[PDB]
């Protein structure tokens, strides 16, 4: 006998297997590292896919400045990533969006993001994944650097007593020419400061579905998060008033999309014409958007506006303009046996380049130029995942373009697109002239860097086509973005952390990424989950552990075992109907006043505030 | 109210321009009366259209090709334990000594291990002196109550193995010197390359079997009900739980989470430090011997030891390591078992009805060593082994909802018992089992892909995606259309190395697209 | 070891010492300290301020008790409920639960046709008594119809809803119809057109051969299956034309299919599949099956089926101008290729009415018969078997219902025993009292109980069950609830062999003594009542110390001791091999372990 777990895809469809074709959802145990190598060949592919050679000197680093926007050159196989940006047609697709919304549309837009500025506290920038200290040159959370900042701003010329976004960002302005500042200690110049502030460091963190692109996810410093956050809340604000825009929400709003789309469709194409799609994905999203781009683009939106907002947008560009790029790692030696290993950092493989081999020395000789002590003045890309609302917009941009030659043929194009994945469809009469739109369609994308794939994108007839993990098929919309929580990383406080798996089980289950009987077997998971966690158990077993020979001691004064806590050998209430309500709501008449009042005792020395927290 | 500007910045901003522009201000007055002239930009998409060869084919006139596999001597056991050669020896369970502790204490009372006396020359192995002499530490260690292990020789050896050496401060270094002692860049090696296993076959079926002890994974309680839909639920819960909990893989994966659990443990609160823990599961039910139902009968197993290195956890992204001492009555096979060092150790027993008493058939006994290192990170990826169940449930819950929607009615049972699935071929034909007999087949997939889990399996199943909805596309007359498939069969040969599940894979997939092309026409032979 | 920090006068002032039994819990402090503090400590009453506090929550659960909970189904898609609509509708399934609106018609509608469906497959249990066996089911079927005790003769004419069960019911009744038709789940109309009977024969295997019939003549119809109309005309057992109105995959798929089968067209028609001569039986268990049906039950078996028969329909290339009304193999609604006369369209074809009511004969196959043959309805296009709880109803003729299972079997049995007790001489508490227990493997209860029993080692379990009763009933130690658990295996000669730890009967099932299960369960404090699948039964008789002593119905020749963990863990089989004095482990349950010492 044989097996081959595919011959279910036979007599059955896709929609319904397709799941089981990838692992389960969790942190990945690639361990997916930055290294310097890595870092190096992203570097050289970025200034490759810029097709030209111009450079002009600066003044500030007396460095070079490899200017690719508006002069490409090397037309060659062009059918290759690209990154050298048109401003004309940029501006032009910006003017035929802004036409087919409306004129008030980014004044509109622009004005809500302001006033939401506004009454903004900084303390938002609390609210991070993580950053780059440039006191400590390394990688925290946001508070952590923030009180880094604020303290150091304090010891060395007074404290910061704004409590308001702008007023940070115009004491970071101000400290941009400070020629002295200190810290808990020891104090630097104006350059060095700069720099910090310009650096930027290559997270190995990757943790999502679908693929795990993100090996050297950026994680800038705190100067530039206000700017970068206000130029994501205007370009929110925009994506929302846009249809084909998925990027902000999912799900249940994506599906509606996604039929209103198609339906829209069936509704205007005539009956003569014949529609297709494509799976396009998008290839080096990071290496090809340039924020000099983006800085025409914003000053184009707010050209009929407060100067404010006019010169506010134009911050974060500039300052990914000039990006200081932190090298990884250094190298290391090693004789013929290996019984010896010399470590050296980046900083000093200038210094042995005719030691390293040769494709990682043709790797080093033409940036050595760009290095300064262990750093690389990248004067433009994007790598971070930031911008994504942004570059959104920009392939909105391209979708909404229509000219007279296309009329004339009876053709035309509509479609969706995410961050650096979307879905085309065409529409013609004929079964020639469908190529001649595609090719028409990825010259207009071509012009400003949003290149395409060809090895992972594919096209069939109208109705099977996958967007963001959802295979959209004739019916039976089939999601793979179930997603889990993880106690052991993030253990915020015994009480919370049920109540939150709850909830995002509730909305898994609303997006269609769940079932019934599978989030009854996940609740019952993330239980042992959380059990094991806080090493807790009920009471019916017969452990031993720390925490239970006083709970199995103190289990006999009481009836309401039904009452009882799960941090306190209690057991399950809640169910599918219950998940909104927290297992406390739940028992609060049920638990025997005693163990209730002693509970919910505010004068103890310590969702529903309970005595179960861990400060 | 405005946001005071620096110089700097004004430099910068005025600096960091187009090219045509040198000033914040031309480039902003060009932009705020930026025109559209919509012929020029025809002309220009125009010209970068004709200057650009995009191909467009359609897979039909075009097909794919069957993939080029790597050539060289078969893929290897990898996983840490041993799943089909494996043996264990059995014994009750006490809630009072329900710990690892105690538990192998207790194994080792009644003087079964103390019989283990491996002899001097293996079978195949590269270290076996440093094998024995650890297992005797062990023995030793056991006795006297106590875990640890003092004397830190074996341990360090192979520990080390890995990389060990003497570091030179930079400063320290000059141009002599280096000539002296030939330094160089410390050149980075690549996996080798390697066949299509012939044996991964035999564990799926032998995994598909259902074992004699049942209970092996531990799970939750059920909560009350308070309409139809949480009691529909309940019982599908119940079925499929009661359906793979008798399965040999659930063993499998009993097994890792309780030696996880206690690994966890030991690299937190004995750090720096050499400990020693058992492989072991615990059951709670067996089947009759003289009738084929359950019975309750709680129980525990010990399948071999695992040692530990000093671990911290906070350096070289917590890389830590280990030593294996599992037990089996299967002598070993050269190509499967390539890391494993051999030997024979003694005799063991093996029990099976007769009539209405038991027997016990004396048989060989052999102890696989082997070293391997492990990670914080694997350690909450296989800990968390019982999310295989979710991923099942939903492939489940996929039929038996559609099917019920198309007819407007429960269809649970009926689709269970007699929908049927293909599963394999045998003598060159199809076979087909019921959901209630393939649900096995899908836990099973979900688990190796659980243990096999790398970015060539990553990058392996992000592909396939692509032929297979192409494929579907073809079953349904839809001129599938691509623009470089060549290429998308070099990105998948190219994550091919040193992983037998990809491997397995791909062969069956080039074995699906060769069957359907009695039906498809996108495909060559 | 303390990370979790703390105050330190609120410690003090709560008297919190530490290690209170070797646990630190510490200003720092670990977590157990919670524990110590909510088990003994201060006690306070906020719980008014708690709740106003939190009153959205609360409110939320108020809300949340406040719902009546109704039923749910599998369909598709042709602010106080969005904190629940992930609970309430998805998109395979929904549940109707309702909050303050009221209307039971639809529902009742739906028991009404669950019903006659089910009646009239009752009938369907002879070849000659078919009418009378049915309207006497219908005569002694009465019911709690909504609200009234209503009967199920009057019923089926009172109401208004075309249906297969409905009509075949009713022509009986020499009830009025509406002219319309019933080729299996699917609806039909006629438009135009007239015909006559014709046959024709079609293989099977190559070889043998079956006579169908069919019409010669043009005539039009209008088809309509769930969610998707049509109209068509037949002509000569083939199908001419036909256009769609209301388009689904699913739907337009089955409805066209069906519609070709009504037209015959096809040359499965001709031959048969390689799949019919695995059967070839066009027949029942003693009657006969036309050809359509038996293709229609063949297309229900996989979509495969489907396939291939769509395929039998010739399969073209679309020329322009028709692509918006061509039509797919799948049901898309476009294609380049579509099949051979065929048009998609949007909006639902508006369906005729007949306003000419008639009636019809009922045949030996209780066949219907308005005129020129054209059968409305039959028992062939009904679904099979489906066995579904009926309230509000009284059935009292026979064949109302098997009602006859194991499970009822075992529980009256033990009703059976329960009742036996009956306060007074000749019973169990008499013979207790004697110590006559040799008399109980004679009752007659248990005599009726034993078929019930697994046959192939009942000997072994009538040994146990009569050695726990002797050591029970001597000692005048027992408990009656284990007694009567046990006591159905005290009927046939004891034999040697391999005891396990629970009885099994014939159906699969079991059970276990000291333990309790969903067939049998009791529990103290609670001792009059003995549970069984949840149906609490009550005794005859009051005691309270006739159970509290079980030390002997747990094993055969032991009592339980007192608890002891040095005493070895063991199982049920070394127990032979032990002596006197030698108390020993052993579990009684899930992780339920208890001491026991030999006599």
């Given at each position: 006998m044989?097996?081959?777990?595919?011959?279910?895809?036979?007599?059955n469809?896709?929609?319904?297997?397709?799941?089981?074709?990838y692992?389960?959802?969790?942190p990945?145990?690639?361990?997916?590292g930055?290294?310097?190598?890595?870092?190096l060949?992203?570097?050289?592919?970025t200034?490759?896919?810029?097709?030209?050679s111009?450079?002009?000197?600066?003044?500030?680093?007396?460095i070079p400045?490899?200017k690719?926007?508006?002069?490409?050159?090397?037309?060659?196989?062009?059918?290759?990533?690209?990154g050298?940006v048109?401003?004309?047609?940029?501006?032009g697709?910006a003017?035929?969006?802004?036409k087919?919304?409306?004129?008030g549309?980014?004044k509109?837009?622009?004005?809500?993001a302001?006033?939401e500025?506004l009454?903004?506290?900084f303390?938002?920038?609390?609210?991070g994944?993580?950053t780059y200290?440039?006191?400590?040159?390394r990688?925290?959370?946001?508070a952590?650097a923030?009180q880094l900042?604020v303290?150091?701003?304090?010891?060395?010329?007074?404290?910061?007593?704004?409590?308001?976004?702008?007023?940070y960002?115009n004491?970071?302005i101000?400290?941009l020419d400070?020629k002295?500042i200190?810290?808990?200690?020891?104090?630097?110049?104006?350059?060095?400061?700069?720099?910090r502030?310009?650096?930027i460091?290559?997270?190995?963190?990757?943790?999502?579905?679908?693929?795990?692109?993100?090996?050297?996810?950026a994680?800038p410093?705190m100067?530039?998060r206000?700017?970068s956050?206000?130029?994501?809340?205007?370009?929110?604000?925009?994506?929302?008033?846009?249809?084909?825009?998925?990027?902000?929400?999912?799900?249940?709003?994506?599906?509606?999309?996604?039929?209103?789309?198609?339906?829209?469709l069936?509704?205007?194409?005539?009956s003569?014409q014949?529609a297709?799609?494509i799976?396009?994905?998008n290839?080096?999203?990071?290496?090809?958007?340039?924020?000099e781009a983006?800085?025409a683009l914003?000053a184009?939106i707010?050209?009929?506006?407060?100067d404010?907002?006019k010169?506010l947008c134009?911050?974060?560009?500039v300052?990914?303009?000039?990006?200081?790029?932190?090298?990884?790692?250094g190298i290391?030696?090693?004789?013929?046996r290996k019984?010896?290993e010399?470590?050296?950092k980046?900083?000093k493989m200038?210094?042995?380049?005719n030691?390293m081999?040769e494709?990682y020395?043709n790797?080093?000789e033409?940036?050595?130029?760009?290095i300064?002590?262990?750093?690389c003045?990248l004067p433009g890309?994007?790598?971070?995942?930031m911008?994504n609302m942004?570059?959104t917009?920009?392939?909105?941009?391209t979708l909404?373009?229509?000219?007279?030659?296309l009329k004339?043929?009876?053709?035309?194009?509509?479609?969706?697109?995410?961050?650096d994945?979307?879905?085309?469809?065409a529409?013609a009469?004929?079964?020639?002239?469908?190529?001649?739109?595609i090719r028409?369609?990825?010259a207009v994308?071509?012009?400003?860097?949003?290149?395409?794939?060809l090895?992972?994108?594919?096209?069939?007839?109208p109705?099977?086509?996958?967007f963001?993990?959802?295979?959209?098929?004739?019916?039976?919309?089939?999601?793979?973005?179930?997603?889990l929580?993880?106690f052991?990383?993030?253990g915020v406080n015994?009480?919370?952390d049920?109540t939150?798996?709850?909830?995002?089980?509730?909305?898994?289950?609303?997006n269609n990424?769940?079932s019934?009987?599978?989030?009854?077997?996940?609740?019952?998971?993330?239980?042992?989950?959380?059990?094991?966690?806080?090493?807790?158990?009920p009471?019916?077993?017969?452990?031993?552990?720390?925490?239970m020979?006083?709970?199995?001691?103190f289990?006999?004064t009481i009836?309401?075992?039904?009452?009882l806590?799960?941090?306190?050998?209690?057991?399950?209430?809640?169910?599918?109907?219950?998940?909104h309500?927290?297992?406390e709501?739940?028992?609060?008449?049920?638990?025997?006043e005693?163990?209730r009042?002693?509970?919910?005792?505010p004068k103890?020395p310590?969702?529903?505030?309970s005595?179960?927290?861990?400060? | 109210?405005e946001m005071?500007?620096?110089?700097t910045?004004?430099?910068?901003?005025?600096?960091?321009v187009?090219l045509?522009f040198?000033?914040?201000?031309?480039?902003?007055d060009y932009?705020?009366?930026?025109?559209?002239?919509?012929?020029?930009?025809?002309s220009?998409?125009?010209?970068?259209?004709?200057?650009?060869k995009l191909?467009?084919?359609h897979?039909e006139?075009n097909?794919?090709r069957?993939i080029?596999?790597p050539?060289?001597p078969?893929?290897?056991?990898?996983?840490?334990?041993?799943?089909?050669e494996?043996?264990?020896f059995?014994?009750?369970?006490?809630?009072e000594?329900?710990?690892?502790g105690?538990?192998?204490?207790?194994?080792?009372?009644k003087?079964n291990?103390?019989?283990i006396?491996?002899?001097?020359?293996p079978?195949?192995?590269k270290?076996?002196?440093?094998?024995?002499?650890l297992?005797?530490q062990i023995?030793?260690?056991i006795?006297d109550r106590?875990?640890?292990?003092?004397?830190?020789?074996?341990?360090?050896?192979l520990?080390?193995i890995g990389?060990?050496?003497?570091?030179?401060?930079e400063?320290?270094?000059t141009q002599?010197?280096?000539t002296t002692?030939?330094?160089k860049?410390?050149?980075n090696?690549?996996?080798?390359?390697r066949?299509f296993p012939?044996?991964?076959?035999?564990?799926?079926?032998?995994?598909?079997?259902?074992?004699?002890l049942?209970?092996?994974?531990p799970?939750?309680?059920?909560?009350?009900?308070?309409?139809?839909?949480?009691?529909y639920?309940?019982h599908?819960?119940?079925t499929?739980?009661?359906?793979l909990?008798?399965?040999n893989?659930?063993?499998?994966?009993?097994?890792?989470?309780?030696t996880?659990?206690?690994?966890?443990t030991?690299?937190?609160?004995?750090?720096?430090?050499?400990?020693?823990?058992?492989?072991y599961?615990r059951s709670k039910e067996r089947?009759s011997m003289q009738?084929?139902?359950?019975?309750?009968?709680?129980?525990?197993?010990?399948?071999?030891?695992?040692?530990?290195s000093?671990?911290?956890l906070?350096?070289?992204?917590?890389?830590?390591?280990?030593?294996?001492?599992e037990?089996?009555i299967?002598e070993?096979?050269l190509?499967?078992?390539?890391?494993?060092t051999?030997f024979?150790?003694?005799?063991?027993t093996?029990?099976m009805?007769?009539?209405?008493?038991?027997?016990?058939?004396?048989?060989?006994?052999?102890?696989?060593?082997?070293?391997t290192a492990?990670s914080?990170?694997?350690?909450?990826w296989?800990?968390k082994?019982?999310?295989?169940?979710?991923?099942?449930?939903?492939?489940?819950?996929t039929?038996?909802?559609?099917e019920?929607?198309?007819?407007?009615?429960?269809?649970?049972?009926?689709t269970?018992?007699?929908?049927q699935m293909?599963?394999?071929?045998?003598?060159?034909?199809?076979?087909?089992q019921?959901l209630r007999?393939?649900?096995?087949?899908?836990?099973?997939?979900?688990?190796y892909?659980?243990?096999?889990?790398?970015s060539q399996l990553?990058?392996?199943c992000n592909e396939?995606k692509?032929?297979?909805?192409?494929?579907?596309?073809?079953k349904?007359?839809?001129?599938?259309?691509?623009?470089?498939?060549?290429?998308?069969?070099?990105?998948?040969?190219?994550?091919?190395?040193?992983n037998?599940?990809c491997?397995?894979?791909?062969?069956?997939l080039?074995?699906?697209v060769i069957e359907?092309?009695?039906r498809?026409?996108?495909?060559?032979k | 070891?303390?990370?979790?920090?703390a105050?330190?006068?609120?410690?003090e002032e709560?008297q919190i010492?530490?290690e209170?039994?070797?646990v630190?819990?510490?200003?720092?402090?670990?977590?157990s300290?919670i524990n110590y503090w909510?088990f003994?400590?201060?006690?306070?009453?906020?719980?008014?301020?708690?709740?106003?506090?939190?009153?959205s929550?609360?409110?939320?659960?108020?809300?949340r008790?406040?719902?009546?909970?109704?039923e749910?189904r599998?369909?598709?898609?042709?602010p106080?409920?969005?904190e629940?609509?992930?609970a309430?509708?998805?998109?395979?399934?929904?549940?109707?639960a309702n909050?303050?609106?009221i209307?039971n018609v639809?529902?009742?509608?739906?028991?009404?046709?669950?019903?006659c469906?089910?009646?009239?497959?009752?009938?369907?249990?002879?070849?000659?008594?078919?009418?009378?066996?049915?309207?006497e089911?219908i005569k002694?079927?009465?019911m709690?119809?909504?609200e009234?005790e209503?009967?199920?003769?009057?019923?089926?004419?009172?109401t208004?809803d075309?249906?297969?069960?409905?009509?075949?019911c009713?022509s009986?009744?020499?009830?009025q119809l509406?002219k319309?038709?019933?080729?299996?789940?699917?609806?039909?109309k006629?438009?135009?057109?007239?015909?006559v009977?014709?046959?024709?024969?079609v293989?099977?295997?190559?070889?043998?051969?079956?006579?169908?019939?069919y019409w010669?003549?043009?005539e039009?119809f209008?088809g309509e299956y769930?969610?998707?109309?049509?109209?068509?005309?037949?002509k000569?057992?083939?199908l001419?034309w036909?256009?769609?109105?209301?388009?689904?995959?699913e739907d337009?798929?089955?409805?066209?299919?069906?519609?070709?089968?009504?037209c015959?067209?096809?040359?499965?028609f001709?031959?048969?599949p390689?799949?019919i001569?695995?059967?070839?039986?066009?027949?029942?268990?003693?009657?006969?099956?036309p050809?359509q049906?038996?293709?229609?039950?063949?297309?229900?078996?996989?979509?495969?089926?489907?396939?291939?028969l769509?395929?039998?329909?010739?399969?073209?290339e679309?020329?322009?101008g028709?692509?918006?009304?061509?039509?797919?193999?799948?049901?898309?609604?476009?294609?380049?290729?579509?099949?051979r006369?065929?048009?998609?369209?949007s909006?639902?074809?508006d369906?005729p009415?007949?306003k000419?009511?008639?009636?019809?004969?009922?045949?030996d196959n209780?066949?219907?018969?308005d005129?020129?043959?054209?059968?409305?309805?039959?028992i062939?296009?009904?679904?099979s078997?489906?066995?579904?709880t009926?309230q509000?109803?009284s059935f009292?003729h026979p064949?109302?219902?098997?009602?006859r299972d194991?499970?009822?079997?075992?529980t009256?049995?033990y009703?059976a025993?329960?009742?036996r007790l009956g306060?007074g001489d000749?019973?169990?508490?008499?013979?207790?009292?004697?110590?006559?227990?040799?008399?109980?493997?004679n009752?007659?209860?248990?005599?009726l109980?034993?078929?019930?029993?697994?046959?192939?080692?009942?000997?072994?379990?009538?040994?146990?069950?009569?050695?726990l009763?002797?050591?029970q009933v001597?000692?005048?130690?027992?408990?009656?609830h284990?007694?009567?658990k046990?006591?159905?295996?005290?009927?046939?000669?004891?034999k040697?062999?391999?005891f396990?730890?629970?009885?099994?009967?014939s159906?699969?099932?079991?059970v276990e003594?000291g333990?309790?299960?969903?067939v049998?369960s009791?529990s103290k404090?609670?001792?009059?009542?003995?549970?069984?699948?949840?149906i609490?039964?009550?005794?005859?008789?009051?005691?309270?110390?006739e159970?509290?002593?079980?030390s002997?119905?747990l094993?055969e020749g032991?009592?339980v001791?007192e608890?002891?963990?040095?005493?070895?863990?063991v199982t049920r089989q070394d127990?032979?091999?032990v002596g006197?004095?030698?108390?020993?482990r052993?579990?009684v349950?899930?992780?339920?372990?208890?001491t026991?010492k030999?006599?």
């Amino acid at each position: 006998m044989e097996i081959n777990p595919y011959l279910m895809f036979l007599n059955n469809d896709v929609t319904s297997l397709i799941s089981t074709t990838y692992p389960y959802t969790g942190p990945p145990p690639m361990s997916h590292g930055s290294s310097t190598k890595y870092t190096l060949e992203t570097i050289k592919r970025t200034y490759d896919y810029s097709r030209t050679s111009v450079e002009k000197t600066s003044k500030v680093f007396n460095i070079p400045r490899r200017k690719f926007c508006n002069c490409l050159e090397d037309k060659d196989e062009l059918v290759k990533p690209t990154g050298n940006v048109d401003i004309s047609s940029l501006l032009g697709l910006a003017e035929m969006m802004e036409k087919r919304m409306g004129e008030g549309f980014f004044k509109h837009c622009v004005m809500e993001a302001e006033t939401e500025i506004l009454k903004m506290h900084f303390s938002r920038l609390t609210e991070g994944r993580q950053t780059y200290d440039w006191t400590s040159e390394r990688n925290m959370p946001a508070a952590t650097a923030l009180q880094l900042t604020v303290d150091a701003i304090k010891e060395t010329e007074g404290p910061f007593k704004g409590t308001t976004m702008l007023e940070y960002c115009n004491k970071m302005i101000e400290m941009l020419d400070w020629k002295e500042i200190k810290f808990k200690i020891d104090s630097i110049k104006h350059d060095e400061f700069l720099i910090r502030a310009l650096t930027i460091n290559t997270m190995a963190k990757d943790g999502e579905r679908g693929k795990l692109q993100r090996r050297a996810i950026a994680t800038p410093g705190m100067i530039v998060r206000p700017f970068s956050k206000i130029v994501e809340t205007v370009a929110q604000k925009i994506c929302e008033k846009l249809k084909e825009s998925g990027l902000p929400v999912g799900g249940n709003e994506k599906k509606a999309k996604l039929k209103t789309t198609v339906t829209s469709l069936n509704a205007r194409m005539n009956s003569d014409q014949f529609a297709v799609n494509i799976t396009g994905d998008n290839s080096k999203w990071n290496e090809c958007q340039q924020p000099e781009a983006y800085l025409a683009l914003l000053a184009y939106i707010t050209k009929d506006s407060s100067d404010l907002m006019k010169d506010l947008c134009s911050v974060a560009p500039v300052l990914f303009c000039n990006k200081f790029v932190k090298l990884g790692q250094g190298i290391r030696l090693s004789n013929k046996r290996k019984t010896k290993e010399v470590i050296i950092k980046a900083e000093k493989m200038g210094k042995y380049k005719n030691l390293m081999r040769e494709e990682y020395k043709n790797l080093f000789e033409p940036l050595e130029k760009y290095i300064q002590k262990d750093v690389c003045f990248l004067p433009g890309g994007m790598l971070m995942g930031m911008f994504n609302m942004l570059s959104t917009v920009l392939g909105v941009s391209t979708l909404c373009y229509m000219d007279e030659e296309l009329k004339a043929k009876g053709c035309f194009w509509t479609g969706l697109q995410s961050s650096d994945d979307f879905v085309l469809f065409a529409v013609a009469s004929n079964w020639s002239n469908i190529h001649w739109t595609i090719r028409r369609f990825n010259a207009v994308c071509k012009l400003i860097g949003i290149n395409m794939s060809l090895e992972k994108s594919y096209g069939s007839l109208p109705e099977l086509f996958e967007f963001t993990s959802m295979f959209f098929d004739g019916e039976f919309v089939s999601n793979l973005a179930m997603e889990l929580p993880a106690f052991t990383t993030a253990g915020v406080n015994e009480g919370v952390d049920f109540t939150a798996a709850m909830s995002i089980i509730k909305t898994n289950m609303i997006n269609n990424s769940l079932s019934p009987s599978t989030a009854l077997m996940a609740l019952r998971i993330c239980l042992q989950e959380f059990r094991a966690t806080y090493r807790v158990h009920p009471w019916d077993s017969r452990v031993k552990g720390g925490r239970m020979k006083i709970i199995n001691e103190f289990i006999k004064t009481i009836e309401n075992k039904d009452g009882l806590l799960i941090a306190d050998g209690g057991k399950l209430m809640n169910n599918i109907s219950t998940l909104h309500i927290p297992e406390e709501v739940l028992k609060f008449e049920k638990m025997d006043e005693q163990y209730r009042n002693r509970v919910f005792n505010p004068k103890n020395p310590f969702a529903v505030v309970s005595t179960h927290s861990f400060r | 109210i405005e946001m005071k500007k620096g110089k700097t910045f004004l430099e910068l901003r005025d600096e960091s321009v187009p090219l045509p522009f040198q000033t914040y201000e031309q480039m902003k007055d060009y932009c705020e009366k930026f025109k559209g002239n919509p012929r020029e930009l025809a002309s220009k998409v125009s010209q970068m259209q004709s200057n650009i060869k995009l191909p467009i084919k359609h897979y039909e006139q075009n097909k794919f090709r069957q993939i080029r596999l790597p050539k060289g001597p078969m893929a290897p056991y990898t996983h840490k334990f041993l799943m089909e050669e494996a043996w264990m020896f059995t014994k009750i369970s006490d809630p009072e000594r329900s710990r690892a502790g105690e538990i192998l204490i207790d194994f080792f009372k009644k003087g079964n291990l103390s019989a283990i006396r491996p002899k001097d020359k293996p079978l195949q192995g590269k270290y076996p002196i440093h094998y024995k002499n650890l297992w005797n530490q062990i023995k030793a260690a056991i006795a006297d109550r106590t875990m640890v292990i003092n004397e830190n020789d074996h341990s360090e050896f192979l520990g080390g193995i890995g990389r060990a050496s003497k570091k030179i401060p930079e400063i320290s270094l000059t141009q002599d010197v280096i000539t002296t002692e030939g330094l160089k860049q410390s050149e980075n090696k690549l996996p080798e390359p390697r066949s299509f296993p012939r044996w991964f076959n035999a564990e799926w079926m032998w995994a598909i079997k259902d074992s004699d002890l049942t209970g092996w994974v531990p799970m939750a309680e059920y909560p009350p009900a308070d309409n139809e839909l949480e009691d529909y639920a309940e019982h599908l819960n119940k079925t499929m739980e009661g359906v793979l909990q008798g399965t040999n893989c659930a063993r499998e994966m009993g097994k890792c989470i309780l030696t996880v659990g206690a690994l966890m443990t030991e690299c937190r609160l004995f750090p720096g430090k050499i400990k020693v823990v058992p492989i072991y599961a615990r059951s709670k039910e067996r089947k009759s011997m003289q009738e084929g139902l359950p019975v309750p009968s709680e129980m525990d197993c010990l399948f071999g030891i695992c040692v530990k290195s000093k671990s911290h956890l906070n350096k070289d992204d917590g890389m830590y390591t280990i030593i294996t001492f599992e037990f089996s009555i299967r002598e070993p096979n050269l190509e499967k078992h390539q890391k494993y060092t051999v030997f024979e150790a003694g005799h063991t027993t093996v029990r099976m009805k007769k009539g209405e008493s038991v027997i016990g058939r004396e048989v060989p006994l052999y102890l696989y060593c082997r070293t391997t290192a492990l990670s914080k990170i694997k350690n909450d990826w296989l800990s968390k082994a019982r999310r295989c169940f979710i991923t099942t449930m939903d492939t489940v819950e996929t039929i038996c909802l559609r099917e019920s929607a198309k007819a407007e009615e429960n269809l649970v049972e009926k689709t269970l018992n007699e929908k049927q699935m293909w599963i394999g071929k045998k003598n060159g034909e199809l076979i087909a089992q019921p959901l209630r007999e393939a649900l096995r087949v899908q836990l099973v997939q979900q688990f190796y892909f659980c243990i096999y889990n790398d970015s060539q399996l990553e990058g392996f199943c992000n592909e396939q995606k692509k032929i297979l909805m192409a494929l579907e596309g073809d079953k349904k007359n839809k001129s599938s259309f691509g623009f470089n498939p060549e290429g998308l069969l070099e990105k998948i040969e190219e994550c091919l190395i040193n992983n037998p599940m990809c491997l397995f894979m791909a062969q069956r997939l080039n074995e699906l697209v060769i069957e359907a092309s009695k039906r498809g026409a996108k495909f060559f032979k | 070891k303390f990370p979790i920090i703390a105050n330190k006068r609120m410690l003090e002032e709560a008297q919190i010492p530490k290690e209170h039994n070797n646990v630190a819990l510490w200003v720092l402090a670990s977590a157990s300290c919670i524990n110590y503090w909510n088990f003994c400590g201060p006690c306070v009453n906020n719980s008014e301020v708690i709740k106003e506090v939190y009153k959205s929550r609360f409110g939320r659960l108020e809300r949340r008790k406040e719902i009546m909970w109704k039923e749910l189904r599998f369909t598709l898609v042709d602010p106080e409920r969005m904190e629940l609509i992930h609970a309430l509708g998805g998109e395979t399934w929904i549940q109707e639960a309702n909050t303050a609106g009221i209307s039971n018609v639809d529902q009742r509608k739906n028991d009404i046709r669950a019903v006659c469906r089910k009646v009239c497959l009752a009938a369907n249990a002879s070849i000659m008594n078919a009418k009378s066996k049915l309207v006497e089911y219908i005569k002694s079927t009465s019911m709690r119809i909504g609200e009234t005790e209503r009967k199920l003769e009057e019923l089926i004419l009172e109401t208004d809803d075309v249906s297969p069960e409905v009509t075949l019911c009713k022509s009986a009744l020499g009830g009025q119809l509406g002219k319309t038709l019933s080729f299996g789940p699917m609806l039909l109309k006629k438009i135009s057109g007239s015909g006559v009977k014709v046959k024709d024969t079609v293989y099977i295997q190559g070889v043998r051969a079956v006579q169908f019939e069919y019409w010669s003549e043009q005539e039009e119809f209008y088809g309509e299956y769930k969610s998707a109309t049509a109209l068509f005309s037949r002509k000569e057992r083939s199908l001419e034309w036909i256009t769609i109105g209301g388009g689904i995959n699913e739907d337009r798929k089955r409805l066209l299919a069906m519609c070709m089968i009504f037209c015959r067209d096809g040359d499965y028609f001709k031959d048969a599949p390689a799949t019919i001569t695995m059967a070839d039986l066009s027949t029942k268990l003693g009657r006969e099956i036309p050809y359509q049906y038996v293709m229609m039950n063949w297309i229900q078996k996989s979509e495969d089926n489907l396939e291939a028969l769509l395929y039998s329909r010739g399969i073209v290339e679309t020329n322009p101008g028709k692509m918006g009304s061509s039509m797919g193999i799948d049901g898309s609604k476009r294609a380049i290729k579509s099949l051979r006369a065929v048009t998609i369209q949007s909006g639902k074809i508006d369906m005729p009415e007949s306003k000419e009511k008639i009636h019809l004969e009922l045949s030996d196959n209780l066949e219907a018969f308005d005129s020129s043959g054209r059968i409305v309805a039959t028992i062939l296009d009904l679904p099979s078997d489906k066995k579904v709880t009926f309230q509000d109803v009284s059935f009292q003729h026979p064949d109302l219902a098997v009602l006859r299972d194991e499970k009822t079997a075992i529980t009256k049995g033990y009703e059976a025993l329960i009742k036996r007790l009956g306060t007074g001489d000749n019973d169990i508490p008499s013979l207790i009292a004697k110590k006559d227990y040799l008399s109980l493997y004679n009752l007659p209860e248990v005599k009726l109980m034993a078929p019930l029993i697994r046959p192939n080692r009942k000997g072994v379990y009538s040994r146990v069950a009569r050695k726990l009763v002797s050591t029970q009933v001597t000692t005048g130690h027992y408990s009656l609830h284990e007694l009567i658990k046990v006591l159905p295996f005290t009927y046939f000669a004891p034999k040697q062999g391999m005891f396990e730890g629970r009885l099994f009967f014939s159906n699969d099932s079991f059970v276990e003594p000291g333990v309790n299960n969903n067939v049998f369960s009791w529990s103290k404090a609670d001792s009059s009542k003995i549970y069984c699948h949840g149906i609490a039964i009550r005794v005859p008789l009051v005691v309270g110390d006739e159970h509290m002593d079980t030390s002997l119905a747990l094993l055969e020749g032991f009592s339980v001791c007192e608890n002891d963990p040095r005493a070895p863990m063991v199982t049920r089989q070394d127990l032979i091999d032990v002596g006197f004095g030698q108390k020993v482990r052993l579990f009684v349950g899930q992780g339920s372990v208890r001491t026991f010492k030999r006599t």
